[PDB]
Enzyme design. Structure first.
Site, mmCIF file in Angstrom:
data_model
loop_
_atom_site.group_PDB
_atom_site.id
_atom_site.type_symbol
_atom_site.label_atom_id
_atom_site.label_comp_id
_atom_site.label_asym_id
_atom_site.label_seq_id
_atom_site.Cartn_x
_atom_site.Cartn_y
_atom_site.Cartn_z
ATOM 1 N N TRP A 19 -6.288 -43.822 8.084
ATOM 2 C CA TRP A 19 -4.742 -44.062 8.655
ATOM 3 C C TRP A 19 -4.722 -43.512 9.875
ATOM 4 O O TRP A 19 -4.786 -41.906 9.328
ATOM 5 C CB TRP A 19 -3.890 -44.317 8.325
ATOM 6 C CG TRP A 19 -2.552 -44.631 8.776
ATOM 7 C CD1 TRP A 19 -2.477 -46.115 9.557
ATOM 8 C CD2 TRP A 19 -1.388 -43.664 8.515
ATOM 9 N NE1 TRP A 19 -0.809 -45.740 9.774
ATOM 10 C CE2 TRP A 19 -0.506 -44.759 9.176
ATOM 11 C CE3 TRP A 19 -0.554 -43.141 8.160
ATOM 12 C CZ2 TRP A 19 1.313 -44.667 9.240
ATOM 13 C CZ3 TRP A 19 0.733 -42.487 7.834
ATOM 14 C CH2 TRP A 19 1.421 -43.465 8.501
ATOM 15 N N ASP A 48 -0.241 -42.885 -0.985
ATOM 16 C CA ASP A 48 0.379 -43.360 0.235
ATOM 17 C C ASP A 48 1.233 -45.023 -0.650
ATOM 18 O O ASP A 48 -0.037 -45.675 -0.238
ATOM 19 C CB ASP A 48 0.061 -43.000 1.194
ATOM 20 C CG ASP A 48 0.139 -43.890 2.111
ATOM 21 O OD1 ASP A 48 1.244 -44.102 2.567
ATOM 22 O OD2 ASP A 48 0.320 -42.982 3.290
ATOM 23 N N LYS A 83 8.648 -50.581 4.786
ATOM 24 C CA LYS A 83 8.702 -51.935 5.167
ATOM 25 C C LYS A 83 9.367 -53.182 4.002
ATOM 26 O O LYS A 83 9.624 -54.168 4.876
ATOM 27 C CB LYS A 83 6.723 -52.046 4.941
ATOM 28 C CG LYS A 83 5.908 -51.588 6.212
ATOM 29 C CD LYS A 83 5.506 -50.074 6.220
ATOM 30 C CE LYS A 83 5.469 -49.984 7.804
ATOM 31 N NZ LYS A 83 3.660 -48.833 7.105
HETATM 32 O O1 LIG Z 1 1.519 -49.436 12.255
HETATM 33 C C1 LIG Z 1 1.263 -49.071 11.251
HETATM 34 O O2 LIG Z 1 0.398 -48.711 10.902
HETATM 35 C C2 LIG Z 1 2.717 -48.712 10.432
HETATM 36 C C3 LIG Z 1 3.408 -48.340 11.131
HETATM 37 C C4 LIG Z 1 3.550 -46.959 11.034
HETATM 38 C C5 LIG Z 1 2.472 -46.755 12.416
HETATM 39 C C6 LIG Z 1 2.319 -44.954 12.553
HETATM 40 C C7 LIG Z 1 3.504 -44.082 11.964
HETATM 41 C C8 LIG Z 1 4.268 -44.186 10.576
HETATM 42 C C9 LIG Z 1 4.380 -46.226 10.720
#
Ligand SMILES: O=C(O)CCc1ccccc1
Ligand SMILES: O=C(O)CCc1ccccc1
Lengths: 396, 396
Positions: B130, B211, B246
């Site tokens: 991520w 996380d 979320k």
């Molecule tokens: O799209 C995502 O991976 C989750 C939303 C998000 C994206 C970037 C930073 C915080 C939350």
């Protein structure tokens, strides 16, 4: 991994809150952290704020993420407040604003931006200082050095010592100025002194960083921004870390802004890209609710009128308490002339109490002030004035 | 000072938002940033949230600053959600929770805390990753290294390669695990695999950092915390960066928590003192509104019942879209078996599209996905399914 972590002392202002809470004595008085209290000794939500919150409840249809820099209208309203409607800074698109979690968040964003992207190594702050400046700038790896500011004997800004101590600042150093209501002294440059410092800053190559948390609390919204505007007229570059915590009584919603100014639109946009990167690596995007409230009030004529009157009302009540404080100290038999307190702007009086006098005030009398001798005049009421002044006179 | 600042690329997920906004084509479809959309293709405020906000409007009497660690009830409810009511961690007072501005804020707080107060120099994350983990940890001066995770040919967790790549991690390194709904693969360890990793982590001396942004979106609230709880049963120390963005659809209110666990109450309290110091140097105290909403819902039986059903409803709609996506791809003439998509948890499908296929999708078809090939199944509806599947089939 954690077995050997060193203990630390608490935030020396926010930490007063815990002490005050644990105190089970009925007559305790909180004159510590700078929040406004009304006549009844509470810290109300503004009516303009409640009205805006009702609007948001009825009309918001999503909590989808804000952009990294927050609500566009919030930025627009911020720049107008800072620089004036019709400012060349706005017309020439030389300013970019990120909505942040408080002015504190804006200070950290500025510090991270500068540390990573410029040659900045040192930030100059005033002595006496606001404790969290050192904490924030040191966290980003920046040195903090202090300049002279306050003549404690005449209770004025020591302009000579200020200018002379800043002779040690090199070109490329940051110099932090409080926009108005200097914390903790309550003594601000005159317009003429602001103009002199603006000129000096340009000649010396300093980067100005304004900490602007009290717009509206010295004389008025437009008046309080004169110094910032004097600097903006003279400089190609500067940063403003501003706050709506105090002027909207929105402390816990964390509503502030980091505004970046450069020579032209191309430079500020490229620089602002890296400011957004500093945000991405921190809290990613700012909290909507408090900033939405501010944007709602600032963009609606009726709510704005109500809010600006509420702000005037807060300033005026503090001014009344200021006079009553001095009168009551006299009546209670104080061994000093405290007239100098009337000259001070903002929420506080920088009273001249020693650290031991403040400790005794807390210990013996349950009266809580900051160790620097700073007392929150905005926390005084007709009902608590007599006890608090009796306490102060007892420790002199 | 700013003349020579280097341009940077935008947040590679949040930056999709701007691209999507500037796109003036009517049939554009956003499958990028992971926000939930309902059947109508919008991202509503939850009903439980609106009810809590009405309560706050009617009953809040102040915006006075929260403590540095936020609302006490919010921490309590968080720990119960994470560890289970009656957990020995809670009974033994081994956990301390700071309310933060999102899980993103919690990640930064953890990183600053670790960098300043421990010997931690490296954090291990999964590949695929991520993006913001690298940004956050690098900002605090920590190296990020990647471990193997996903077998792209069997579409499973490559447990062998995971274990073998982590053999390179030294004692005292941090290892980051996603609590559930691994982003972007949607593939999570089984309970048995979680238990194996917990044991390995203890033997190898890694510090676990969870996380945990999707609790409730894999199988259910309690089920999704099994892996974390397996680790908590085995370790003296760990950190959780959790999010309510979320599971409450509260993205823009920035509602998360950083939870610190140590061997005993004395150690965690002393360590938590330094975590509060890392907060003081950043944004000072967290935003009240979103956390108040969460605490209000979690502590009231009726609202909690409504909210948990809304969360179930979101998960179930995503599961329906998941099946419909695969069916429609087949019907539209896809040249691959996409059955593997059904096995994935959470909001996304890690579809196997190349970076050039996603660029073409955006360019030619106005269909926006992340460059990794990650697509937001939670952004699909019965109305946009046909166009988006036609687009995907066209680029294969
Ligand atoms: O799209 C995502 O991976 C989750 C939303 C998000 C994206 C970037 C930073 C915080 C939350
Ligand atoms: O009391 C003050 O100086 C202002 C309130 C405050 C204190 C510490 C951090 C942020 C704001």
């Amino acid at each position: 991994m954690f077995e050997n972590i060193t203990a630390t002392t608490a935030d020396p202002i926010l930490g007063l809150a815990d002490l005050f809470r644990a105190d089970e004595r009925p007559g305790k008085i909180d004159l510590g952290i700078g929040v406004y209290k009304d006549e009844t000794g509470k810290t109300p939500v503004l009516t303009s704020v409640k009205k805006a919150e009702q609007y948001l409840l009825e009309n918001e249809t999503t909590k989808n993420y804000l952009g990294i820099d927050g609500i566009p209208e919030f930025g627009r309203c911020t720049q107008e407040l800072l620089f004036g409607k019709g400012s060349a800074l706005i017309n020439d698109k030389r300013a970019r604003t990120a909505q942040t979690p408080g002015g504190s968040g804006a200070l950290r964003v500025a510090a991270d931006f500068l540390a990573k992207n410029t040659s900045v190594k040192r930030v100059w702050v005033s002595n006496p200082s606001w404790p969290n400046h050192k904490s924030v700038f040191n966290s980003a790896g920046l040195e903090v050095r202090e300049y002279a500011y306050y003549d404690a004997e005449n209770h004025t800004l020591d302009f000579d010592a200020l200018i002379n101590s800043l002779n040690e600042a090199q070109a490329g150093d940051v110099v932090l100025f409080h926009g108005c209501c200097h914390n903790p002294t309550g003594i601000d440059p005159t317009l003429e002194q602001w103009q002199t410092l603006a000129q000096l800053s340009v000649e010396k190559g300093w980067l100005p960083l304004f900490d602007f948390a009290y717009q509206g609390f010295a004389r008025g919204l437009e008046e309080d921004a004169e110094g910032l505007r004097a600097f903006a007229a003279m400089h190609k570059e500067l940063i403003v870390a501003s706050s709506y915590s105090k002027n909207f009584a929105l402390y816990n919603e964390r509503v502030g802004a980091c505004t970046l100014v450069a020579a032209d639109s191309e430079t500020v946009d490229r620089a602002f890209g890296q400011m957004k990167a500093a945000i991405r690596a921190n809290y990613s995007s700012p909290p909507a609710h408090g900033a939405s409230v501010v944007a709602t009030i600032l963009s609606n004529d009726a709510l704005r009128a109500i809010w600006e009157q509420e702000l005037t009302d807060m300033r005026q009540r503090i001014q009344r308490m200021r006079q009553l404080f001095v009168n009551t100290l006299q009546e209670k038999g104080a061994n000093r002339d405290f007239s100098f307190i009337i000259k001070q702007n903002g929420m506080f009086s920088f009273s001249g109490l020693t650290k031991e006098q403040v400790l005794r005030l807390r210990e013996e009398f349950g009266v809580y002030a900051v160790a620097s001798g700073r007392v929150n005049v905005a926390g005084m009421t007709p009902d608590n004035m007599a006890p608090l002044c009796e306490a102060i006179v007892a420790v002199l």
